[PDB]
Design a binder for this molecule. Structure first.
Ligand SMILES: Nc1nc2c(ncn2[C@@H]2O[C@H](COP(=O)(O)OP(=O)(O)OP(=O)(O)O)[C@@H](O)[C@H]2O)c(=O)[nH]1
Ligand SMILES: Nc1nc2c(ncn2[C@@H]2O[C@H](COP(=O)(O)OP(=O)(O)O)[C@@H](O)[C@H]2O)c(=O)[nH]1
Ligand SMILES: COc1ccc(/N=N/c2cc(OC)c(OC)c(OC)c2)cc1O
Ligand SMILES: [Ca+2]
Ligand SMILES: [Mg+2]
Lengths: 426, 155, 437
C-alpha cells in the first residue's frame, strides 16, 4: 500500500484540493517549483504516497484537477503552487453546471468523464502498488457533486479492489443560501453511500459557526473556512505521509473504522482552533472531543461513538497521551458504545504542522452524524414537497423517481445510526 | 385561451408580454393543473415586477394551489425578501397554512432565510403555530441546532 | 540428530524471529557472518545445535528458518540488519500488499498469491534434512498475515508433511500494544482452522509481558523491542532442550509426550524466573528455592491466568545455570506439601526436571541483568481456559451485531465460518471443564 490518486473536482474541490497540496508540500519541504529544500529524512520516506518523482529531483503531485467551468483552472494557476501540477492532468470543460447536479452527472459532466478517466489510467499505470483514490469536492453544487460522484462510480468499476476516500463539503445556508443545494446534496449522499468506502464530513455549517462565534469573524470568507479544511486534511493524512509505528493505509483505516458498510461517514475535528494570519496534553484531548471543534455541526454528546482514531503531532510524552486518552474513555464512558472493545486508537507524530507546536486531529464514527443528515433532509423535504425548480432536473434526463429513491435511502441512514445508537450489549 | 400563455410568461419573467396578455383580457387568476396561478409562478421565480403588476390587476394574493401553498409560502421557501414584503403589503395572510401544516414562517426557518424570518415576525407571524408533526418555528430551531434562528425567535 | 525448521510469519513472527536467532547466535558461539570457531567439524555436523543450524563448505552456519510477510518493510529490516549475512536470502520472502489486518485476505485472497513459493522454499530447506522432526511456527494471533496466512500454511504442511510434528509460538493480543479492532475475530478463526494441524502451541499474552517489563524492569512504556527481548529469552529456555544435551523434552515428539495428554488441550503455560533489571548489576543471586517458588507467582506467567483456580495435568521444570539436583528436590518437596497445587486425579502427581548447567545468556543492549540460575516452568493447567474465555467474550460483544463481518465475506470467506469457529471454541471451553476448571 503506497500510491494514492488524488482528484479535485468542481470549484470547491479544486479550492480545498489546491490548499491541501500547499500545506503538505510545506510540511514535506517541497517548494512551489517542485524542488525539495527540507532538512529531515522523515519527509521523503513516504513522499511517494502523494508525489510522483521526476527527473532533476522534481516531485509532481499525483493530482488530477477537474472542473466544467474553465475559470477554475485560472484561479489555481495564479496560486503559489499553481504550476507544480502536471499540465497533462488539467481537464476543464467550457460550460459549468450552474449548481445543477443533473448537468454534472448526466450531460455536461458525462461528456467529459472519459477525458478524466484517461488521465486516471495514466497515473494508475505509474503505480507500483496503488492503494486507492482520494477526492475533495462539494455536495451542494453541480460539478464536484454531480460529476464528482459519476467519476467515483466509474473509477470504482475499473479498480474495484482499491479504496475510495473522499473529502466532502456539506452545504449550509449560512455560507450559500441557494435552494437547489439540498437536492444536490441528497442526490450526492445517495451515491456516496453505495460507492465509497470512507467519507470525511466537512460541513460548511460547522465551519461558519467556528469562524463566526469561536474565532470572532463577523463575515467569514472562503479563506477562513478553507483554513480549517486544509488543516483537517493535513491531520487525517498524517499517518499516510510519515513513517509512524503503524503502516496505516486506506484499507487498515476502513477495516477498523467501518463496522457496517454504509456507516463510513466520519466527523473530523482539529485542535487548537485558530485563524489564519494571527497547549498541554489534557487540554488537547479535551478540546479534541469538544463539540465546538467538530468539522460537522453535530453534538457528539447526542450520540454514541462506534470507533475513533485520534492523532497527535509535536513533542510530548507518549505515555501521558495514553493516560489522558484512557481518562477520556472513563469520564465519557456513556458516549462510547460498550460492544466494540478497544474502539479508540491513538498515534503520535513528531513533525507538527505550520505555526502551531502542538496538534490534535480527531476522526470519529459517531451515531450523532444523523443530525447532519436530518438537517439536510428537512431542507430537501420542504423543497421537494413543493416541486420547486424540479424541472431543472427532469429537463436534463432525470426522472422524479431518482429524487424519491435518494430521499428514501437518506432517511434509512438516519434510522440506522439511531438503531446502533440504542443497541446494547446485555 | 390566453390564461395558459400568461402562466408561462410570468414564470419566464417576460414583463412586456404579461402587459400584452392582460390588455387582451387574459385570466390573471387562471390555474394550471396543480392550482398554481400566475402570481404563484412569478413569486416562485423571483420576477418581482411581474408580481407587482399582477397585484394591481386583480390577482388573488391568497390563492392556494392544490397543496395549499399561497404565493407567500413559495416566496418564503425560495427566499425572496422583497417579494415577501410586497405580498404582505398587498393583503397576504402571514399565517396561512398549507396541506403539510406549514406556515410561511415554517419554511423561512427550515431554509435559513433569517432576514425573511425577521420580516414575518414583525408582520404578525405566530410563533406558536404547529405543523402536522407538531413543531413550531422554534421547535424546528432547537432540533437542527440553529442558534442564529433560535435567537431571532426568542426576542 | 534430527532437524527443526522455524517459520516466521508476519511482522510479529518476523520481529521475534530476528531477536530469537540473535540470541541463538550468542548462546551457541556463532558469529553474525555464520562462522563458529568451536565447531571442530567443518562442512558438516551431528551435534545437537545442528537441529537449528545447517553448515556449508566454508564453515558458514545457516539457520533452518523461513521468514514470510505480505508486506516488505519488516523483513527489509532483517535483510539489511546486523545478522543479514546469516539467513538464506531466498528464505526471506515478501509480497507487496499486506492483509490489512484481515484474516480472509491473509488466508484467501492475497495469501493465495504466495503460498506455493513459500512451500517450495520450505522444500529446499527440507531437502537438506536427514531426519526432519517438524516445524516451529511464529505468528501473531491478531494480525491478518499472522492469522490468515498462518492457518493456510499449517493446512498445507499438514498435507505435505503428514509425519512431522508442528509447534506454534503464537502472540496473544492485548489492548495496550494492539493494532486492529478486529483482532478478536482473527484469533478465533486462526485457532479453529489450525487446531487440528498443530501438536503443541505456546501462547504469549502481550498483556503479561508488557506488565513484567513495566514492573520487574522499571520500563515506563515498553516497545516491541523490549517485549521481544524478554519473549526470546523465554523462547530460548523452551527450545534449549532441542539444541543442547539434555534428558527432558529431547525432541518434538517428547514435547507432546510430556505436556499434552489430550490433543485439543495443547496450550501449555510457561512461567519464567528470575527477571531482574540490568540497572541492578550487583543484585544478590537468588537461590534454587526462590526461583522455583517463583514459578507459582501469577505475576511471572507469560499468559495472565490464575493456576490456583485450576488443575495441573503436566508440570516440567527447565533450569539453567548453577543448580544442584539435590537442591531441586528440597525446593520441590516443599511445594508438594506446603502449597495447594492440585493435579487432576488421573495424572501422576509429579514434577519432571531438566537441568542445563550453563547460566542464561544476555544480549548486549538488552534489559536483563546477568543471573547465576534461572528456571522456565512449562505446565499444562486448566486455568489457561480463563484466557480463552476472555477472548471469546470480546468476540461475542461484536459478533452478535455482525460488526465488521462484511470485511471478511468480501474477501473470499463465507459468513457461516464465523459460527463453525466459535462453536469450536465453545467445545474447547467444555474440554477444559470436563477434564477438571
Ligand atoms: N510481542 C509482539 N507483538 C507484536 C509485535 N508486532 C506486532 N505485534 C502484535 O501482533 C498483533 C498484530 O499482528 P501483526 O503480526 O503485526 O500482523 P501481520 O502478521 O503483519 O499481518 P498484516 O495485517 O498483514 O499486517 C498485535 O496484537 C500486536 O500487538 C512484536 O514485535 N512483538
Ligand atoms: N468550504 C468551502 N465551500 C465551498 C467553496 N466553494 C464553494 N463551496 C460550497 O460548495 C457548494 C457549491 O459547489 P461549487 O464547488 O462551488 O460548484 P461546483 O463547480 O458545481 O462543484 C456550495 O455549498 C458552496 O457553499 C470553498 O472554497 N470552501
Ligand atoms: C479502534 O480500532 C482502530 C481504529 C482505527 C485504526 N487506525 N486507523 C488509522 C489511524 C490514524 O491515526 C490515528 C491514521 O492517520 C490519520 C490512519 O491513517 C489512514 C489510520 C486502528 C484501529 O485499531
Ligand atoms: Ca560441524
Ligand atoms: Mg503486517
Amino acid at each position: 500500500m503506497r500510491e494514492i490518486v488524488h482528484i479535485q473536482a468542481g470549484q470547491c474541490g479544486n479550492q480545498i484540493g489546491a490548499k491541501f497540496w500547499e500545506v503538505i508540500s510545506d510540511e514535506h519541504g517541497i517548494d512551489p517549483t517542485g524542488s525539495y529544500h527540507g532538512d529531515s529524512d522523515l519527509q521523503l520516506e513516504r513522499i511517494n504516497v502523494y508525489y510522483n518523482e521526476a527527473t532533476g529531483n522534481k516531485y509532481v503531485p499525483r493530482a488530477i484537477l477537474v472542473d466544467l467551468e474553465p475559470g477554475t483552472m485560472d484561479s489555481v494557476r495564479s496560486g503559489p503552487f499553481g504550476q507544480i501540477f502536471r499540465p497533462d492532468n488539467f481537464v476543464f470543460g467550457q460550460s459549468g453546471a450552474g449548481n445543477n447536479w443533473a448537468k454534472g452527472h448526466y450531460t455536461e459532466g458525462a461528456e467529459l468523464v472519459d477525458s478524466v478517466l484517461d488521465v486516471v489510467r495514466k497515473e494508475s499505470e505509474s503505480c507500483d502498488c496503488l492503494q486507492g483514490f482520494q477526492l475533495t469536492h462539494s455536495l451542494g453544487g453541480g460539478t464536484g457533486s454531480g460529476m464528482g460522484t459519476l467519476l467515483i462510480s466509474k473509477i470504482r468499476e475499473e479498480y474495484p479492489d482499491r479504496i475510495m476516500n473522499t473529502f466532502s463539503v456539506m452545504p449550509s445556508p449560512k455560507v450559500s443560501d441557494t435552494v437547489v443545494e439540498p437536492y444536490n446534496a441528497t442526490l450526492s449522499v445517495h451515491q456516496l453511500v453505495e460507492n465509497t468506502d470512507e467519507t470525511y464530513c466537512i460541513d460548511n455549517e460547522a465551519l461558519y459557526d467556528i469562524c463566526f462565534r469561536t474565532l470572532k469573524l463577523t463575515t467569514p470568507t472562503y479563506g477562513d473556512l478553507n483554513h480549517l479544511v486544509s488543516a483537517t486534511m493535513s491531520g487525517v493524512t498524517t499517518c499516510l505521509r510519515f513513517p509512524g509505528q503503524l503502516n496505516a493505509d486506506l484499507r487498515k483505516l476502513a477495516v477498523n473504522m467501518v463496522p457496517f458498510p454504509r456507516l463510513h461517514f466520519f466527523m473530523p475535528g482539529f485542535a487548537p482552533l485558530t485563524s489564519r494570519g494571527s497547549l498541554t496534553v489534557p487540554e488537547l484531548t479535551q478540546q479534541m472531543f469538544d463539540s465546538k471543534n467538530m468539522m460537522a455541526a453535530c453534538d457528539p454528546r447526542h450520540g454514541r461513538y462506534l470507533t475513533v482514531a485520534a492523532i497527535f503531532r509535536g513533542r510530548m510524552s507518549m505515555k501521558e497521551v495514553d493516560e489522558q486518552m484512557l481518562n477520556v474513555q472513563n469520564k465519557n464512558s456513556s458516549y462510547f458504545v460498550e460492544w466494540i472493545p478497544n474502539n479508540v486508537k491513538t498515534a503520535v507524530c513528531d513533525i507538527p504542522p505550520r505555526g502551531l507546536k502542538m496538534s490534535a486531529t480527531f476522526i470519529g464514527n459517531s451515531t450523532a452524524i444523523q443530525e447532519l443528515f436530518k438537517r439536510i433532509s428537512e431542507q430537501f423535504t420542504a423543497m421537494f414537497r413543493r416541486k420547486a425548480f424540479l424541472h431543472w432536473y427532469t429537463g436534463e434526463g432525470m426522472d422524479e423517481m431518482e429524487f424519491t429513491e435518494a430521499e428514501s435511502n437518506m432517511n434509512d441512514l438516519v434510522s440506522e445510526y439511531q438503531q446502533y445508537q440504542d443497541a446494547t450489549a446485555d | 385561451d390566453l390564461g395558459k400563455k400568461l402562466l408561462e410568461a410570468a414564470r419566464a419573467g417576460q414583463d412586456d408580454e404579461v402587459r400584452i396578455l392582460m390588455a387582451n383580457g387574459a385570466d390573471v387568476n387562471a390555474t394550471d393543473a396543480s392550482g398554481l396561478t400566475p402570481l404563484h409562478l412569478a413569486a416562485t421565480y423571483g420576477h418581482l415586477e411581474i408580481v407587482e403588476v399582477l397585484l394591481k390587476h386583480g390577482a388573488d394574493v391568497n390563492a392556494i394551489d392544490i397543496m395549499g401553498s399561497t404565493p407567500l409560502h413559495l416566496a418564503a421557501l425560495i427566499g425572496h425578501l422583497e417579494i415577501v414584503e410586497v405580498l404582505l403589503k398587498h393583503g397576504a395572510d402571514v399565517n396561512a397554512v398549507d396541506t403539510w401544516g406549514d406556515t410561511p414562517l415554517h419554511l423561512a426557518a427550515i431554509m435559513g432565510h433569517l432576514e425573511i424570518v425577521e420580516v414575518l415576525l414583525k408582520h404578525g407571524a405566530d410563533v406558536n403555530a404547529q405543523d402536522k408533526f407538531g413543531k413550531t418555528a422554534f421547535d424546528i430551531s432547537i432540533d437542527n441546532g440553529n442558534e442564529d434562528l433560535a435567537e431571532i425567535l426568542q426576542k | 540428530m534430527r532437524e527443526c525448521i522455524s517459520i516466521h510469519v508476519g511482522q510479529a513472527g518476523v520481529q521475534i524471529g530476528n531477536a530469537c536467532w540473535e540470541l541463538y547466535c550468542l548462546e551457541h558461539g556463532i558469529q553474525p557472518d555464520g562462522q563458529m570457531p568451536s565447531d571442530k567439524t567443518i562442512g558438516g555436523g551431528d551435534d545437537s545445535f545442528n537441529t537449528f543450524f545447517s553448515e556449508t563448505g566454508a564453515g558458514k552456519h545457516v539457520p533452518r528458518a523461513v521468514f514470510v510477510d505480505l508486506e516488505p518493510t519488516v523483513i527489509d529490516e532483517v535483510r539489511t540488519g546486523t545478522y543479514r549475512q546469516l539467513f538464506h536470502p531466498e528464505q526471506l520472502i515478501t509480497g507487496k500488499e499486506d492483509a490489512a489486518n484481515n484474516y480472509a485476505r491473509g488466508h484467501y485472497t492475497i495469501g493465495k498469491e504466495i503460498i506455493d513459493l513459500v512451500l517450495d522454499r520450505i522444500r529446499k530447506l527440507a531437502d537438506q534434512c536427514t531426519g526432519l522432526q517438524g516445524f516451529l511456527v511464529f505468528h501473531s494471533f491478531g494480525g491478518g498475515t499472522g492469522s490468515g496466512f498462518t492457518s493456510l500454511l499449517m493446512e498445507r504442511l499438514s498435507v505435505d508433511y503428514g509425519k512431522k510434528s508442528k509447534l506454534e509460538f503464537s502472540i496473544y493480543p492485548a489492548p495496550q500494544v494492539s493494532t486492529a479492532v478486529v483482532e478478536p475475530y482473527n484469533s478465533i478463526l486462526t485457532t479453529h482452522t489450525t487446531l487440528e494441524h498443530s501438536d503443541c502451541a505456546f501462547m504469549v499474552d502481550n498483556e503479561a509481558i508488557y506488565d513484567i517489563c513495566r514492573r520487574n524492569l522499571d520500563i515506563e512504556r515498553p516497545t516491541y523491542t523490549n517485549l521481544n527481548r524478554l519473549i526470546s529469552q523465554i523462547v530460548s529456555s523452551i527450545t534449549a532442550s532441542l539444541r543442547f544435551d539434555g534428558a527432558l523434552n529431547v525432541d518434538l515428539t517428547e514435547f507432546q509426550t510430556n505436556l499434552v495428554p489430550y490433543p485439543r488441550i495443547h496450550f501449555p503455560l510457561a512461567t519464567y524466573a528470575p527477571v531482574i533489571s540490568a540497572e541492578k548489576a550487583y543484585h544478590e543471586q537468588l537461590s534454587v528455592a526462590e526461583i522455583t517458588n517463583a514459578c507459582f507467582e501469577p505475576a511471572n506467567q507469560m499468559v495472565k491466568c490464575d493456576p490456583r483456580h485450576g488443575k495441573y495435568m503436566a508440570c516440567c521444570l527447565l533450569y539453567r545455570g548453577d543448580v544442584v539436583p539435590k537442591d531441586v528436590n528440597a525446593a520441590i518437596a516443599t511445594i508438594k506439601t506446603k502449597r495447594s497445587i492440585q493435579f487432576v486425579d488421573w495424572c501422576p502427581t509429579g514434577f519432571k526436571v531438566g537441568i542445563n548447567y550453563q547460566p542464561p545468556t544476555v544480549v548486549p543492549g538488552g534489559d536483563l541483568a546477568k543471573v547465576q540460575r534461572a528456571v522456565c516452568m512449562l505446565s499444562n493447567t486448566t486455568a489457561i481456559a480463563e484466557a480463552w474465555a476472555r477472548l471469546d467474550h470480546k468476540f461475542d460483544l461484536m459478533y452478535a451485531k455482525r460488526a465488521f463481518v462484511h470485511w471478511y465475506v468480501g474477501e473470499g470467506m463465507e459468513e457461516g465460518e464465523f459460527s463453525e469457529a466459535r462453536e469450536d471454541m465453545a467445545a474447547l471451553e467444555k474440554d477444559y471443564e470436563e477434564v477438571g476448571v
